[PDB]
């Protein structure tokens, strides 16, 4: 598709960094902020789809991200219904 | 067997 | 027949010990769960419900609100020393990090007279 | 003002705040086409997709406040990739 | 036809009132709080079912719970879901 | 004399199909078989939770394979299914 | 008569492994070809290890694995690092690493 | 008691030197002695729970391999 | 005399150590510092002899997984040595803190 990974601009990542406490940010500290929500959501994803997949279905739920996210540690309240 | 993925093949 | 008590009832709890054990029974967690499991597994839901709760509610006093929303929760979790170590892992919607005060800034800059 | 003042008054707005930091419509093309490489012509509840956000921005808060301490640690004040890549190191994800 | 779907948002804005009697909870917030409600089901079915099987048993009794609660719930917290459950399951017993 | 069950036996028979002068100390074989329990468990659990998702209430080989695509990284997942879905096919057939 | 390792092609014990599967309390029916699929996805993976321990060991002039070429195998191979990353092998020790900054010259 | 002190100087140079370390400040030898402390006490409280619960007196490695499994430490050579 | 430079005997020590699976922690001291820090949870438990073997195993692993994590931080701050604070910088991204 037309880099969509480039729709996470420079004021998302520095309002992000600016949430964790970053005082002052570089330059290139961007590049390394999309390419590791890039492989994060790689992985996530990659988990959802495989949970959909095996259910046969066509679209991918919010309990399969829950599920997939907590595969990962990352368990996530606020979606389980 | 002794045939596994390139990498160990 | 006699009246039907229910199992939360007779311990005293409020969150349910029936659809506990009902969860357990076809959980496949074991083969035949015990007639007691259900009941403490039930009662520690609550207390650790009723804490965190307790914890919510606090915080939504201290930030002048009457309906508790994930920042009130999000507060209580990683206020308190034993709720975190037991939800580190734990990511909750529409939440937020411990935040920092903006006094700092007037006793160090602010905008001068030039130009004011 | 220099490098000293209006980042310290977005860090308290953001921090008190608890809205998106993202864009939503960005991020669901963005998902979208990760998703792309797994199935063909797949779909997505919207719930799902704000729980991906919701992970990914909290994901990134952790980060960046592990390589804001990375930062510290060097006496430097600005986060530099290194910062990044040792966290991610020590975290176990790129070892 | 109708699709019903179960949650804990009767016994947690009951243990809410109970508690907090003029503090809400919105619906959002309910639904982290049943997610938590779940999750510590989880954790605490899975470790008594470990730790029975690990005793060569095939049932999950109040004693593995307790012992799981101990295990699970950290420092100065573990105590009182221990004794909440103890004096639950005394005043259960004896037919009140 | 705790008749248990180590793997030590069918360990040792993939080893030599592998390298069949290579031995292996009572240590290793003791990891070995420390490690297939873990995969065991590891797989096990998987597949129970997948299931258990789909609210189905058997696991069959394809939970089983599901749940061996979500832990293997890729090309060890690639082959883990292939190596499943030959042995799986072979049954059927004989 | 033929046991269902055998039928299977398999070396590990596919009917061990279907007792195991309906005996761990994991579901209430273990298909027919799950027992099947575990104990041929369990002998690829220690296949795999055993094969990297055994030529690592071999490397270093033995004929016999010992846990310190498991871990050697284990550890150098990413996809068994990520698989068994936070495990740890007794008497296994670490990879020989010096970071280029502790050297010399 | 306190023997904590067992863990030594040469021992906690040795362990830092298999860890690639090859110098080490004054002050690293109370901190470790405090960590591997701490670890220490939660591996072993792990292990008495579950003794205790299969009301054993001897605290079996099997329960110590348990104990280590909690906490992400998979130790291999033991048992599992 | 002769006396090697600070930095040769460490970087032997080092490939010393590094090859050579064994434990480094005193055996006896390091067994009673575990009933000593058992005897805090139930009074009068025996420990079988395997069972601090494995403590000692998982121990040495996990110290020796952290100072090589704490040399990374040490080596992130230009600085050869390491000193506490990297440990610390350590433990904190680990999330142990």
Redesign the interface.
């Given at each position: 598709?037309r880099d969509?990974?480039q729709?996470?601009?420079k004021p998302?990542?520095?309002?992000?960094?600016?949430?964790?406490?970053?005082?002052?940010?570089?330059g290139?500290?961007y590049?390394?902020?999309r390419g590791?929500?890039?492989?994060?959501?790689?992985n996530?994803?990659?988990?959802?789809?495989?949970?959909?997949?095996?259910?046969k279905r066509?679209?991918?739920?919010?309990?399969?991200?829950?599920?997939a996210?907590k595969?990962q540690?990352?368990?996530?309240?606020?979606?389980?219904? | 067997r002794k045939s596994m993925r390139q990498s160990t093949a | 027949r006699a009246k039907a008590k229910s199992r939360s009832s007779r311990a005293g709890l409020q969150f349910p010990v029936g659809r506990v054990h009902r969860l357990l029974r076809k959980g496949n967690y074991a083969e035949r769960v015990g007639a007691g499991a259900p009941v403490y597994l039930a009662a520690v839901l609550e207390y650790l419900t009723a804490e965190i709760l307790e914890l919510a509610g606090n915080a939504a006093r201290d930030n002048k609100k009457t309906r508790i929303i994930?920042r009130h929760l999000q507060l209580a979790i990683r206020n308190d020393e034993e709720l975190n170590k037991l939800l580190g892992?734990?990511?909750?919607?529409?939440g937020?990090?411990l935040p920092?005060i903006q006094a700092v800034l007037l006793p160090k800059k602010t905008e001068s007279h030039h130009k004011a | 003002y220099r490098?000293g003042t209006v980042?310290?008054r977005?860090?308290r707005?953001?921090?008190k705040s608890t809205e998106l930091?993202?864009?939503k419509?960005?991020?669901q093309?963005?998902?979208?086409?990760?998703?792309?490489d797994?199935?063909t012509?797949?779909?997505?509840?919207s719930?799902?997709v704000?729980?991906?956000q919701?992970?990914?921005?909290?994901?990134?808060?952790?980060?960046?406040?592990d390589?804001?301490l990375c930062?510290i640690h060097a006496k430097r004040?600005?986060?530099?990739?290194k910062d990044?890549?040792l966290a991610?190191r020590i975290r176990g994800?790129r070892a | 036809k109708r699709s019903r779907?179960e949650?804990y948002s009767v016994y947690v804005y009951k243990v809410l009132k109970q508690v907090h009697p003029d503090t809400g909870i919105s619906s959002?917030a309910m639904?982290?709080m049943?997610?938590?409600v779940?999750?510590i089901f989880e954790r605490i079915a899975g470790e008594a079912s470990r730790l029975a099987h690990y005793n060569k048993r095939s049932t999950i009794t109040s004693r593995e719970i307790q012992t799981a609660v101990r295990l699970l719930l950290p420092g100065e917290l573990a105590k009182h879901a221990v004794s909440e459950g103890t004096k639950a399951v005394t005043k259960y017993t004896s037919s009140k």
């Open positions: 598709l969509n990974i729709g996470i601009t998302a990542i520095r309002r992000l960094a600016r949430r964790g406490g970053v005082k002052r940010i570089s290139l500290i590049e390394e902020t590791v929500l890039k492989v994060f959501l790689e996530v994803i990659r988990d959802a789809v495989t949970y959909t997949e095996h259910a066509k679209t991918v739920t919010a309990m399969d991200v829950v599920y996210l595969r540690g990352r368990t996530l309240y606020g979606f389980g219904g | - | 994930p892992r734990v990511t909750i919607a529409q937020g990090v920092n | 490098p980042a310290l977005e860090i707005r953001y921090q930091l993202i864009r419509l960005p991020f093309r963005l998902v979208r086409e990760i998703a792309q797994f199935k012509d797949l779909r997505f509840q719930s799902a704000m729980a991906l919701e992970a990914c921005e909290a994901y990134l808060v952790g980060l960046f406040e390589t804001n930062a004040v600005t986060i530099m990739p990044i890549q991610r994800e | 779907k949650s959002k639904g982290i049943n997610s938590f779940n999750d």
